[PDB]
Design a protein around this nucleic acid. Sequence first.
DNA 1: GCTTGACAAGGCCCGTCCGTTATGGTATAATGGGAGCTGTCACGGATGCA
DNA 2: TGCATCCGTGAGTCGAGGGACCATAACGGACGGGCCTTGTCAAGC
RNA 3: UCGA
Lengths: 314, 125, 120, 1049
Amino acid sequence: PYTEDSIRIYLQEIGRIRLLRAEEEIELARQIADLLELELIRDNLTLQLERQPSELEWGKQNKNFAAFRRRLFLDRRAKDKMVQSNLRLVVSIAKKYMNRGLSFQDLIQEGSLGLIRAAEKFDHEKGYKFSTYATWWIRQAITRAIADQSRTIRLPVHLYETISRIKKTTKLLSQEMRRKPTEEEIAEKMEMTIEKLRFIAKSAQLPISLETPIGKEEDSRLGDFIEADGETPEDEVSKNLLREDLENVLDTLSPRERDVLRLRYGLDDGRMKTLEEIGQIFNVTRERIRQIEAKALRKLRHPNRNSILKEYIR
Amino acid sequence: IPPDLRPMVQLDGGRFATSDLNDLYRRVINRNNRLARLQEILAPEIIVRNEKRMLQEAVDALIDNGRRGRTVVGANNRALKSLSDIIEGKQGRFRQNLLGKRVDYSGRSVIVVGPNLKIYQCGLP
Amino acid sequence: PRFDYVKIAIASPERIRQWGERTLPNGTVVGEVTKPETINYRTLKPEMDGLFCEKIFGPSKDWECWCGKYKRVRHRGIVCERCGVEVTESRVRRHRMGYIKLAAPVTHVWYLKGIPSYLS
Amino acid sequence: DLIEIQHASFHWFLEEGLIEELNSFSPISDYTGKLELHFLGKDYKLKQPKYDVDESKRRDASYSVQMYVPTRLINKETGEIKEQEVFIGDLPLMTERGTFIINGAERVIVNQIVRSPGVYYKKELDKNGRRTYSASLIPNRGAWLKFETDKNGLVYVRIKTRKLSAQVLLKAIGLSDNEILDSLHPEFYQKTLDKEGNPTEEEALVELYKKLRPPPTVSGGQQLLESRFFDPKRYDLGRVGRYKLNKKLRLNEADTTRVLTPQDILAAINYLINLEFDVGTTDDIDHLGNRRVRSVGELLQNQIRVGLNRLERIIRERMTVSESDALTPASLVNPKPLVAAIKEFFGSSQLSQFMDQTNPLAELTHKRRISALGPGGLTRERAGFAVRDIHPSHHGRICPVETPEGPNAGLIGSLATCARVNDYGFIETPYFRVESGRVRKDLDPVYLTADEEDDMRVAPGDIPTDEEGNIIGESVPIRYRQEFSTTSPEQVDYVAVSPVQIISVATSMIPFLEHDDANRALMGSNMQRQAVPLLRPERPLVGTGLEAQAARDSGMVIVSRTHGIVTYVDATEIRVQPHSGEEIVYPIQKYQRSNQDTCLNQRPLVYAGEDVVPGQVLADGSATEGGELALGQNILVAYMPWEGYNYEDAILISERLVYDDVYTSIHIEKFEIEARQTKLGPEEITREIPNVGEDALRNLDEHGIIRIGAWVESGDILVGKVTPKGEADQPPEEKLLRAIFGEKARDVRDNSLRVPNGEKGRVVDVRVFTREKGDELPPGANMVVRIYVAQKRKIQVGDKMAGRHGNKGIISRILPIEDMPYLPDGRPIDIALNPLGVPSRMNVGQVFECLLGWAGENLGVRFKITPFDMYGEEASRDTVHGLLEEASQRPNKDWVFNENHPGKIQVFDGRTGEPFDRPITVGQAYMLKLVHLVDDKIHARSTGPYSLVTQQPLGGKAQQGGQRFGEMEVWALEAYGAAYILQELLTVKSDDMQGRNEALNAIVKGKSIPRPGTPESFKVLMRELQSLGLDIAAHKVQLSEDGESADAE
DNA sequence: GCTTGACAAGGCCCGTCCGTTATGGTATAATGGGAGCTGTCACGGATGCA
DNA sequence: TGCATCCGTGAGTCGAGGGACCATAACGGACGGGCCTTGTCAAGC
RNA sequence: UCGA
Ligand SMILES: [Zn+2]
C-alpha cells in the first residue's frame, strides 16, 4: 500500500528482518574479527605498493584467488548482517532523544553510525552480549550528533558539559539554601570568575527566527522591526559636501603646500601614504615635510579665511 | 543564496535572529556529509538507501516546503519558509516588495473640514 | 545597466557551477560550501568553510579580510596569501553565490510534483 | 454579581480542578516494578506570594504562588515510605478584580465557546439522490465516531480514514449476534448484514487491522482498538459527555465518565436506523443547548494534563537507569516542563488577551466576552454566514447588539445582563413563573437552561401587568419552538424578569434604546468603552440607573464592609473602626498608570464621623462619580449647521470647554532604558556624555538620571547612557578635520534615552531597579531604569468625540463664546451639531435624550429612565413634553417651552445679533471623549531607517517608518499620465543604495538629475530565482551582439 | 631656505603558555513513533472504478 | 467511456497597538623581548 | 485585537 510517512516506510523495512539468536552473534563476530586482520594487512601494504593493492593478496601466501574473493565476500556479508539485523535497537534508543534538537529521522541515521563502530570493536572473547556493548556506542553517536548539529551557531562538546555542570550545582545549592538564590554562590563552587558565567548564559540562548509572528495574528513578523547595519544617506550626502568645502581652503594655499596635505592623509588617491614616500619622489630629504605640515596646520587654526570650517566639529 | 538575503543579526538581549533558509541549508549539508561518510566505510545498503531518501526530502523541503511530503518545522511549531514560499503568497516578494513599496518623504494625519478655502488647496501643519 | 529582454531557462549543472566557482590567483577554486557551520560562538566572525564564509562570498567588513594584516584602503583588488579573502567592499557579499556539490542526484520538486508533472 | 464566569471558575479549579488532575496522574510504575510513585493531591500547600499586587506591575514580575504537594515514594519489595514535599510549578493567582498579572501587565482569560460533547445527527444530501443520515459522537478528548448511512440500507462506520462496515466495529468490541438484534427494527439491518459477511468474535479484529494499519496480528488488533476509545488517559467523554449521552439516547446507566461503554455504540446505531422510519430529532450545530462555554477552571485543566504527560516520560526514564536505592523523591519530579506549560498559556496563547483598561465599562465588558476562536474552536477562514448570524436560542443569553464590526463581525460576542453559566457550561436565563394568568413575582426564578424551546411558552418583559391581580393584555406575544406567536395569557408558562435581559451591560447605558436603530446602537456601545477618564467627571442627567451596579463590580471602587464610624480621611487612606485590632486602613491609589496610557486616580468621598453600610461608596474611581459611573459631561447642544464647520459628521465646540477644564484627561506614558553588557566593554550611566553641553544637563543629579518633577519637552535626555566602540576606521576627510583643531574623539558613543517627537509632560516616577537590592533582573543587564511621565491634555482641534447613540465626529474648529449662538437668557451654546445625520441613520433617541436633559437642567432632578416601556406614545413624547411644561411654569423661565413648536426655542446669532429664521432644537447632551486623539495620529518622515534585506523604508510611528504605496495606489497613477512620479516613488524613495544618495544631494546642491538606477528589490528577486534552479538573465538585442547584462555587478 | 644627530613610540615578527577544542572511548541487559485532523466554499484537473 | 472522489488553487486596502561523562593530544589567541620603522625636538648650516 |  502507498503511504507518505517516511518513518513508517523505514520501520516496515526494519520489521521485515528476522532478529539474531544468541549463538549467531558469536558466529558473525568471528568473521568480522577475520575482517579486521584482513584490512590491517592491506593498511600495512598500501604504504609500499603505491596505494593500489588490487591484486596484491598477502593472505594467500586460479583456485587461491577465487577462494580469497569468496572469503572476502562472506566476511563483508557478516558485517552486513550484524548491523542490519540490530536496527531495532537503534529505534528503541533514539526514541528517547527526539525532543531536544533533532527530528526522529536524523537520529536513526546518526545512531546507525555508532552501530557500525560497535560492530568493529565488539570482542566476543569477553562473553558479554552484543546488545550490552552496542548500547554504549549508539548513545554516544546520538549525543555527539546533538553537540555538533541541531544548532545554527553551534557550541563545542566541552561547552555542553559546562552548562550541565552549572545545572547540577544550582540544584545542589537549592537543597542547602532553600530560599533567596544568588549568582555569586554558583561561581564560588565552580572555581570560575563572575565574568565567565555571563558568557555561559549568553551562549546557551537559543536563536530566534526572523519570520516568527510577534503579535497575536500573522499580520507582522520579527524582521519588520530590525534595522540594517548600514549608514543613513544623511551621513553619506554631507560626506560629499565635506569635500566641496575642505578643498576650498586648500586651493588658497601654495601648490606645493596643497600637494603635501593631499597625499599624506589619502586625498585623491584612496590610499594613505607615509612621510618617507613623499621624500623619495622629491629632491628634498626629511624634516622638511614635517615642518611644511606643521606650517600648513598652523595657518588653518587662525581665524582668517577659514570661517566655514567652524561648525564641522563633531 | 547570498548571505545578506539570509541575514543573521543579534538582538539587544544577546539572542540571534536567524532565518529559516539557514536551517534548511544546514539540513542538506548534514545529510550530504553523512552520505559521503556511509559510501566510504562500505555501509549496509539499507542505511545508504535510507540516507539518499532523506537527502531527496531535504532538497524538496528546501525548494517547496510541504509540496510532496509533510511540512517540516523548527523550534516554533509554524511552517518553515522555503525558497518558493517567499514569492507566491500575498506576503511574497512580488505583492509586498515589487508592486508595492514603502516610500520616503511621506506622512499621514487625520482630516478636518476646511471651509473659507478654495479647491487645489489643503491645510498642512 | 540597461537591458532589453529577460529570458528564463532550465539551469544546467555547468551553469550553476559557473556562478559558484570564481577565479582566484592560486591553483584551485575555493567557491564551494562544504560545512554547515555559519559563525563562531566566541567571536562574531565566520568560519573558512560554511554558509557565511568570507573566502566564497567576500569580506564582511569594508577593506578588511578575515585573518588580519589587511585592514586599509591601500590594498584594492588583491587576495591575501595567508587567508584567501579578497580585500574589497562589503557590498559584494549580496551578489556572489556558492554551490553545494551533491553525492547523489536529486529530482526537482517543481517538475515531479507539479502540474501536469512534466517529469512523468 | 456581574463577574461570575471568572470568579466561580477559578474557585472550582482550586478545589475540584487541581484535585482531579493529580488523582488521575497517580500512581505510576517502573518497567520492572521495583518502586511506585503516587501523589497526595488533596493536601497541597499553595503558599504565600512574593510581591504585592502593585509591586509586581512595576518590577516586571507576575503575581504567582509556589505549589507544593506531599509525595510518598514507596517500594514494592523493601517496606519504606519516603514522605517529602516537592515543588511542582508556578501558578499565577487571580486578583480581586478577576484578572491575572503576567510580566507586569494585567491580562484576562476570554471565555471560549465550543461545541458540547455528545452525539449529533444530520440529514445530508451529497448530490441529487436519496436522503442520507449521518452521525458524529464527539468526545471531550479523543477520537471521533462518525456513523454514516448510504443508499440501499448500508450503514457504515468511519474511524479521517476510509469507511468500513458497521458489523466490523460492533463485533470487534465484543458482542453476539443475539445481543444486537434484540435491542435494535432488525429488518433494516439485514441489508447491511448481507453485503458484509458474518464475522465472529475473532474474525473481525484481523480485518480491522488490515484497513486501518496497511501483517495482521491477533494481538495487534486488540491493542489498536482499545487505545482509541477504551484506554484511560487517551479518551475522555467528560462530565458533560456522560450527561448528553443519557439525554439523547435515553440511557439507563450513568457516572462512567472514563471509558466508552460498548452498549452506547449500539444505541447510536439504533437511533440512526430509526431516522429513516420518520422518528427522532435532527440536532442543530448552532443551538446554544449544543454549544458549551469554558473558562479558566477548564482551560487550565488541559494545560496541566499536557504538562503532567511530559513529566511522566521523565519520571519513567529516571526509575530505570538508576538501579540503586536510597534516592530522594524530590529529585524524581522535574518542574521545568510544567512551569513552561503554564507560562505558555498565560503569555504566549491567543486566548489570553491584553486587558482593555480605558474606563471601568471596558474592564467589565472584556471579562464577559464570548469568542468562538482559539486552540480548538474555529478559524477566521472557516467562519461562514450561518455561524455569524443570530440564532433564535440567543434570546437573553448572548447580546444581539454588542459585537465588533469589521473582520470579527459575529465571532466575538458578549454575555447578557442576567445570563449565568452553570457547572455544565451552558448559559441560563432567569424567568418568573406564571400561574393562571398571574405573574408569581414572590419567589426565586427558575433559571431555565435553554429547555424552554420545545416545552415551555415564554413571554418577554414588556407586557402590561396588574398589581397581583392578572395580566392587562388579552393578546400576549410569546415565543414557542423558535417562532413568535400571540396566544392567550392563561396558556403561558414563564415570563422574563427584566426588559434589559436581552442587551448586555454596555448596551444598557444607552437611554431610549427603542427609538434608535440597531446599527447605531452597535456603534454607541463600542464608543462607550473607549471614553477616557476626565479630570472631574459628571453624572448623566438622562441615565438609565444601571451605572451604579457597573461601578461596584469593576473593582476600582472602595466599598465598606464593617458598618462602622469613619475616623480619618485624607488623600491617601481612609481609616474606619468596625463594630456591631479595630482600625482598618483602606489604601487609595493616586495617579497610577493604566494599560491604555490613562490614569487610575481615586478620590475620597466620605467625611470624618459618618455611619457607613456594607455596600457604600467610600472612594470613587477616575471615570466614576459619586455612586454611579460617569464617562462624560452634560453640556449644551444645538442642531444647527454652521458655515461649513459641521459639514460631514464634524463637531463645532466653543472655547468654554477649554478653559473650564472640560474633557481634560491625564495621560501617563512610560519609558524604558537598560544598561546592557556589551562584549567590547560594560555600559554604564554617566552624566558627562560627549557632544552635549549645558542645554540638556540641567535636570540630572550627577548620576545620568533625571529628577522627580522636572518638566521635560520634546528632544530632552531622560537617561544619559554611553556605549564603547572599537571601529577605528576613520575616513581621510575626518582625519584631516580632527588634526587641525585637535579634540581627539573618545571611544564611547552617545546612546542616551530621549523624548520622542510631540511628547511632553512632568516626570512623576524615576524608579530605578538595579542588582543587589532584592529584585530579579533579566540576563545581560546591569541597571534597569523606568521613567513615568504624566501630562495634562486638554481638548483640541482634531480629537474624536462621540455620544451614547453613535454620533461620532472630529472637532474642526474651536470658536470663542462671543461667536457662538446664545439662548434668549444670554447663555451661549457649547456644541453646534449637524441635524442632517439624524434622519438618515435613525438616531431618534439622541433627540429624546437632549430634550429630557434640558428639562432636568432647569429643574435639577437627574432623571432615571429605564429602556423598553408602559403606554404607547404616552411614555416617550408626553414624558419629555410634559416635563418641559413643568420647567416652563417657573416665574423666571418662560422661554423654555413654546406652544407652537414644543421641542424648539428661538436662538440668536452671536456674530450679528439677529435671530434665525426657524427655531432650533436645543438641549443638554452627554458627550464622551474617545482615545483617538490628534497627538497619536501625527507621523512624518524625511529619511530614517531601512529594511534588512530589501533595503526599503520601514513602517511604524514608533520607529520612524514610511507610508506604504501599495498596488491600488500604483493603479491610480497608471490611470493618470504620471509616469515620472511613478518612477520617482519606486526608485529614488525606496530600495536604492545609490539613487537615494544622488537624489538627496541634488536637492541640497540645487541641480536635480534624471535617470535613476536599477532598484534593489529587483536584484533580490533575480538572485532568488537563480537559487531555484532557473537560468534567468537579462540580455541586449543590439546589432550582432547578444550578451548577458550584469545587473548586480 | 634646508640639514643632521638624538630620544623615545610603536608596529610586526618570533619564541613559549595555557585555556580552548576536536576526537575516541565506556562491556549485566536493553531490539517498530508519536500527535493531531474530524464546522469553509467554489472551480479545475487527475485519477479510478466500474 | 462516463461517473465519484480527492487534491491544489484563490478568498480587500492602509494605520495603531504589543511582543552523560572522562582522558588525551592537537590547535590558537595572548604575552613578551628583539628589530627596524616612524614621528618629533633643538640648533647649525 | 482596535480604527476607516
Ligand atoms: Zn588576510
